[PDB]
Amino acid sequence: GPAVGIDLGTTYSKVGVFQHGKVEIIANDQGNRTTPSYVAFTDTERLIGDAAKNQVAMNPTNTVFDAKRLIGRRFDDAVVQSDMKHWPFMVVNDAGRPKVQVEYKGETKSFYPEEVSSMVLTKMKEIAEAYLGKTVTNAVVTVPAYFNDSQRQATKDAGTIAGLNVLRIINEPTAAAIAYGLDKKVGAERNVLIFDLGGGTFDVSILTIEDGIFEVKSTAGDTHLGGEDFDNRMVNHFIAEFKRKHKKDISENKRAVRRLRTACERAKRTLSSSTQASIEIDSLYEGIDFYTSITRARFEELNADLFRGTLDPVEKALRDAKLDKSQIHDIVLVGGSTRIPKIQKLLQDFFNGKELNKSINPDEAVAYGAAVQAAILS
Template sequence: MEDVYEGAIGIDLGTTYSCVGVWQNDRVEIIANDQGNRTTPSYVAFSAEERLIGDAAKNQAAMNPKNTIFDAKRLIGRRFDDPDVKKDMVHWPFEVIEKDGAPFIKVQYLNEDKTFSPQEISSMVLMKMKEISEAKLGKEVKKAVVTVPAYFNDSQRLATKDAGSIAGLEVLRIINEPTAAAIAYGLDSKSAQEKHVLIFDLGGGTFDVSLLNITGGVFAVKATAGDTHLGGEDFDNNLLEHFKKEFQKKTGHDITEDARAIRRLRSACERAKRTLSSVTQTTVEVDSLYQGEDFSANITRARFEEINATLFKSTIDPVERVLKDAKMPRDKVDDIVLVGGSTRIPKVQSLVSEYFGGRQLNKSINPDEAVAYGAAVQAAVLTGQTSDKTADLLLLDVAPLSLGVAMQGDIFGVVVPRNTPIPTNKSRVFTTVEDNQTTVTFPVYEGERTQCRDNRLLGEFELNGIPPMPRGQAELVTTFEVDANGLLKVTAQDRASGRKAQISITNSVGRLSSAEIEQMIKDAEQFKQADKDFSARHEAKSDLEAYIHQVENTITSPELSMKLKRGAKAQVEAELARALEKLEIEDSTSDELRKAQLGIKRALQKATAGLR
């Protein structure tokens, strides 16, 4: 693929499924994968022979649960000791280990133990989306806009950007999922009249609510809230726990430790959840679930709603918070737009509708594709592929969490309040707390609590060389700069001496250094080459096996075996034996296998030359 695509693609990197779109012929095209599906499972699997990504990985999950990785988005940018990570590890069949305070995934690949960071697993999914678009465009793709939950923090955003770099993509912009979905909603129905739109985005693993003001092509986020750890997978987990207990009650067997049985039951639970969105009762059936025991149980929609009642109800809290933050009465919201596969659940719909007084909800956009659609539009705008439709498009987003520094007594000194429009540049003056203090440490936090220990530490830096003076007299100007990706840079300057110190928040746990990213890019290329080699070897092997079979039949057929000279036939048989030997050798290359096939072909041509 010599040509490089001038534009950029839009990728919705989801917890459970991912989707890619591109702006072509004045509209967005969502690109189907090689299986014809417009969404691709965010799954990566490793085996003794190969690496699989997407549908192929998910389809073999029950056979290979320990080496099939999903939910990387629930690990990316988090610490190993994060309570959510600990909670998830109970449900995951794969092994998560700690490395320098960050979670890493341990698998067996090509008969060796390998560890991968969540960024690397996500980069493999991004690389798959890149390949899907390259197959469609016939050109190499180098640029992308990637979406993240609006409530993702600084570490999660930067880790997602790093995943893009490892996949060989220049990430032009990280945009928030509900904002991207708002573009899908508003692009074709632009009007000069101001509209207040609430985006309710409940996906496979994350949940966001954003309130936007849309006027013409300007999409301004007024407030955002959410839960980076709530989605369809949690409903599946609750269903799984319910049926696990039921199976134990019926048979006395606890299947908790059997990764394969859990995987098969989880798949059945996911299917049941989807079915219950359109019918009121279904059956969960798994043949020979554990030690030869079949499992079959009915579940009604009402029971499913009961099992998940607490989680369903919790989706209304962020809606309330967003309206409160934006000082917007419920009846002033013009449209409530549903996004994300989990909004297909009738109970979720009825709770939202009831909250807004029985209002009709807007289901005009495809819940699975809307986010990738919006990302593709933004990708077109950023690469200058504009048209009348996108000419006046402007996205104005906000910082989802308050940002600030720790003051004396562990008090959180907010510099950028939450829901501040970004990009932004805000300053606050701090001072020394001791006489003649010449060094001040600035720990940078994000969160909404008064005490720093209840918020998240992003990193810290020191300002040295402050002239000695009585405490409280030094003026230390601290400036927080948040860019359009929601990424943060902090600077502190002493007014008297002009001394400056700064930090781009890149030194917190789990952050990759540029050297590590470089190494991971090299590794990714090697894995890609290994995948290609495996496919080529597999194809050459299949071709050779079929050819051997065909030639054996030919030389033993009654009409030919009588005519062949003994020496010539022996020559063909020797080549066949040589080829069979090559097939037996595990690491025969595709070239060696093709050469063996050519050897048989030449011997056969020689043996049959001149025969009628």
């Protein structure tokens, strides 16, 4: 094609292409190596990726996200019913199948989860095409190891709808392992642990690889734990701070809260590299500017319990896999949240000082491996 590898994430998607023995993680029109898995509908346009997330604060009812949580599921599923209570957009029942309902150009419309995801995949396809200067058709699309046949089918369908010939649907943890060349034959079998902390989900997977063949020994995690939760802790902290300094509560002003949230998420990223971050919001509430800062130490404290809690699924995966810490040959960090120094410390300490595979940007590892596999299947 070349064929490309696409990581269709719950919160952010990435696309990579293997060329001249190297993988290239493609930046979008805004220079971003990751693209929000968001799609927005307005009185006049359909926005995707950065354009959609950048206006979520002002158009919450018609800005769709989390389509990956619905893809391949039935409307009556307990998780679907639970998730619906937290989404600002409407989810309706079409013959037992869930559909997101929105307003677009003054008319009510509904889309199957795979249709929303096809929109995100189309964006990823275009991003690759703009980079390559060639039409992109063949692709390998990844999915969480626990996805069933229906979820895998619906994901493949999203690709097909986007105009992609999905060469194969592979597991995200496996893709991450492939990125580090852990699929190469060295003789005996090897046990690898994938620690994936994304935007809204946490996945731990233990793979046993031998002769280039992968076996998923165990999976653990929390489908409702990720970077967003850390942002939440920061938001509450700053709402308290603003209330203290201005005797005003912004909690009910949706916009103000989303603006603070965006500022928090950004400050969070900075804290992975620096020990302090500045938050400066012009007229956050009733014309009041909010200029402040937060230290890495404070950020760690606000999230201490959540960070520490990531180790429980690690111990569980190990027990389910019938393996001791020492039997893990490689630990691979995946997901943007694993860039947090405290998380890396916790995991390494748990593994008694064992080195972590973190040379490939964690949030790019899945796409990286997917691109390699795509080239192999091409």
